[model samples]
Target: TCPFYKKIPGTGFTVDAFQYGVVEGCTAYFLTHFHSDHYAGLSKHFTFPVYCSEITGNLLKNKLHVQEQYIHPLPLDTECIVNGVKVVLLDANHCPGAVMILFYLPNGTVILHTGDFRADPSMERSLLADQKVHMLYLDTTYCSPEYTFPSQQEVIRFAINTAFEAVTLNPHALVVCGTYSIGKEKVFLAIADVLGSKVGMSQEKYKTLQCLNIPEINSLITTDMCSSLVHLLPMMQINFKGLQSHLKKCGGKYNQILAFRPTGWTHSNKFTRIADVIPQTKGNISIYGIPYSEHSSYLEMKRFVQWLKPQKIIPTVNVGTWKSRSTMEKYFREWKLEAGY
Candidate 1:
């Protein structure tokens, strides 16, 4: 949790749970997505009537081991009343169950949390303007001028083509992708359909995809190890030693490994060239970091905030980051609003 939940007057809802959030007593609770940092204290202590998308609700029940009765599903783009407040769920366009929460408090304060989203003008005309927000909790992870990475679609095309090239060059090699637990399903799904092969991931990861009930994910999950050329490994498990071990365990089936990491960290330095694919080697492991990410880029974030036009704007701190006012100025320097948020 950051200043969003731990400080400032909120809508009285705990989002993306932290220790302070899961342990505290509240009138209602909601989860935006299933990223590890988002659901910090949920495993140990969960409150009642937690609200989230159906996809997220299923993950809580099947994966996280939360009781079935405690999780509540809110349909996307649908409004429902909960805890004396009107709540609407809008697609965040980030993850399967990710949502941008808009809460209409009984006191007439309309609060909207972007909740880890990319900027899509379609969402504004379809969802937010009618509600009229009073406070905006925006995701400013990349709210600076230095970020200008290409769109995710374009980046994915680059990755898919690169993956195909790797497999064609060496029939015995594997094209491994480093992805978050649930974020980049589209990449795997596309690779499977065009390449005519199933994607391989750990059984645990496969179970996580199965619970989504998404047709694309269900169709591309390979049952056997040798059935597919593309492999999906958890981001944490994409390191050199892990990849080397996995290859060895497969009886030297793959002579070389090509790994891709979809991320935005590559464009941080001004002089750094943001290429479609970047290759790195850790002895036997070849890893490439792509410039695609779920979080909004700096330019896109400025557009969303300017359009929302809330009474006030607050830049939240991510987990483990110290709350310092000195650098808060950096996030808002590109924001041109003079007053009234």
Candidate 2:
């Protein structure tokens, strides 16, 4: 026996569905992004139907390798009905397949769930003058004012400038920055644009980019194409003895290396130590600190919440782990709310 005649104890009034019971009963569950935390439970619990933008659906199906039957692809900014619930998906601007869902229920309650969004102008424009949104479930992951961050364009500019400076200083040196396979490929593309040549990439990265059908910006070279380059090296091949031996054996005069950091490196002292291990010479190893973040900062979150002016705000995704609820409660207290069911 269970509450609401379902095995799950929670209600739709709580956080988003975490089990199959809630998924079966809810009018609909709209996924705002393709991130695992947001949609990982789909294969296990979600059975009724899941809705998202067409691109998101395609990415979820292709990238996450999910089945097509689980997806109800909705075009960006277009409206559709699922289980009698009128829904709309808007651009989130955080990632290629990210979206914000607007749910219109038969009871006249309009819910706007801003799933992990930023203050990008493109996303803002997409959210303009829409239906009256009630019971807003906002993404206040960064509500504290201290988390101010520069725009994506500004960060990209810094990355390009730093990489160029390093390359100019040491043409033969390899420059490597870690990045996500899907998200940070844009940065690698930008670096290619600046260097006017293809940078050496790993086989995994090459395959990932190729799967996405990304065009060659400027004949970017990979490990397989190392012979074409004057000198080549793999990122994370930075062990002191290993690098020193490799350099001593096949090192080309004035050779250079470039590498991008992936998303998971969170500024630990261990990474600093690893970076330092690369042997420095007149052909110095320069590590560029390009500020590229995928999540919304405090200022962006605040501005978006203020603009939307939702009556009730609920933070999802990092709901239990991070103290997002307390932060959102503080912000919500500033706004006025109306009665409800």
Candidate 3:
């Protein structure tokens, strides 16, 4: 028998179950992306079948080191029936493996879940192609006007330019740019491409790259590969003094030491303080604070909401604060969706 679903008393919405409890008889679960916040609940809840795009599945299996049985993979832009619910995976472009889900229910209601997406004008045409959405679950991570970010290409160019400047200033200096192994592999690739040579990787990063089939990026040289050019080493190797000393010993052969650390790279204090810690004999240690974010900005979030024009818009992740919810309600009121419905 179907359980009687009731709207939450104060909120006047029946969607509370989406936040807690299984849908009683619901047979399928849809995971929108690979971020911990979005998919973290999966491991805790029911073991029913889960759905996501191929990129996302591969990332979870290869990058996150999750088991394969946990995810049933599908390609982007394809529609499929999971436990009788029609679903489609659309490109979200938040991270390398993010996606948006469009759900077509049997009750004639259609819902579009935008899983942390930015408003790239390139995505505009693809979004407009889907005009049948009735409700939208948005990624309003940056809904307030105070938030801002540079475009992907601009950030990449800035990092590359900074790396070149650092190299020119101190030919034998060790330059490290921080980025996540899975997420920021592209940034390292970009840096390597600009340098016209390969970079070194720590053993851990080497193993991670292997999972993603990116060992070639670290193929410049190893002790085994003939120590030359820049080698690809893990960020962990540079943290300990002993490992740093070892790399410095090899410093006689290479022109520069370029390593990538995703988490420690962008934080303001970490980058500034580390730049000041260069030893007198190590040439110069320079750090580049590149602006590479995984979420949308305020203006982009606003534009996405306005363009979709769904009956109701629900925010996810960090965007689900009280202030953001109030701001969204105000915006929707101006657009004429009757207040407090």
Candidate 4:
């Protein structure tokens, strides 16, 4: 989940490399978000001040059981001095408590680290239009041109409509959504709202949602799994056989199952319109793979690079092998040439 190298160049700070153990000359550790891949190295015994957004800090404390003193939650859009370097946090638009970190050095260098973000217009208008970012540590998870999909809202609406139509046809059909620990709350929550249905989840995930403190979503969670047709489960248990086993455990309350497995990887450039993306049905089980990605699309990433025009870009994902890095380098070269910088 991490890159080959952890530390950002020209700084003593390391971003999301706790799994590699502490490096010499590192002054502080910065966690981009609460995702397991990003926070792989963090543990209760680790010694060093970890900085992140307030919501992420709460997750680290409550979910991972990290010490409160070691976790420092920085407010969004506020600048603070850490070890004489100016640090600021901006909304990442990826997941809850996710943020993009900006660093201002005394030597007149400004660096921006996009911590697993999806591009949004609000960032261009308010925060980055006026200033110059000297160095950019980019999240290059989907940097290739072939990686493209519909917007998040459109995908959510599609999921909602799909579920609505399915249940309308057969009201006893169970809707099961596979999700990560923190992200994809918007999908299930929106489906619940439109259907006016209760969403069931495990006690552990319910407590994690409580840490998020979202009122609308909090109201949807139900402890009794039998009462709610819509249930949330980890992505590992989203397969047809898995859903069948789950239905068996429910004692045949539901006549059939409609599962939604949402992720960006399911999308490619082949489908031009949203309607072309469809579901797969087999017997009493139907599965929908929604292209609901939190990462920026290829076009969005190009637009961001053109607008920001950073002097240097550091790829944070898929850099373990130089082969991947070289492929992304071609895209970066084309983007940079068009920008004429």
The per-residue C-alpha lDDT of model 1 at residue 270 equals 55
Judge candidate 2 at residue 272 and give its lDDT.
43
RMSD of each: 3.0, 6.6, 6.8, 2.0
Of 2 and 3, the candidate ahead on lDDT is: 3
TM-score of 3: 0.71
Q: What is the lDDT of residue 27 in candidate 4?
A: 82
lDDT of 3: 0.56
Candidates 2 and 4, the one with greater lDDT: 4
Q: Which candidate number would show the highest lDDT if scored against the true structure?
A: 4
Which lDDT tens digits does candidate 1 get at residues 249-301?
77768788888777654534355444524677876579877776788877777
What does the lDDT come to for candidate 1?
0.73
- Tens-digit per-residue lDDT, 8-77, candidate 2: 1222322234344454445445666655655655552245556667656666565555677777777776
lDDT digits (tens) for residues 46-155 of candidate 4: 77889888889989898888898888889888878877788898989988989998988778889899999998767898467768999899999989988888888888
Runs of candidate 4 with Cα error greater than 4 angstroms are 1-5, 267-269
TM-score of each: 0.87, 0.72, 0.71, 0.94
* lDDT for each residue of candidate 3 in 131-248, tens digit (9 for 90 to 100): 6777777666666655655666866776677667666776664555453334655666677566666655455555454533344644542334233334444455544353366556
TM-score of 2: 0.72
Misplaced by over 4 Å in model 3 are: 1-26, 41-47, 62-70, 207-283, 319-321, 331-341
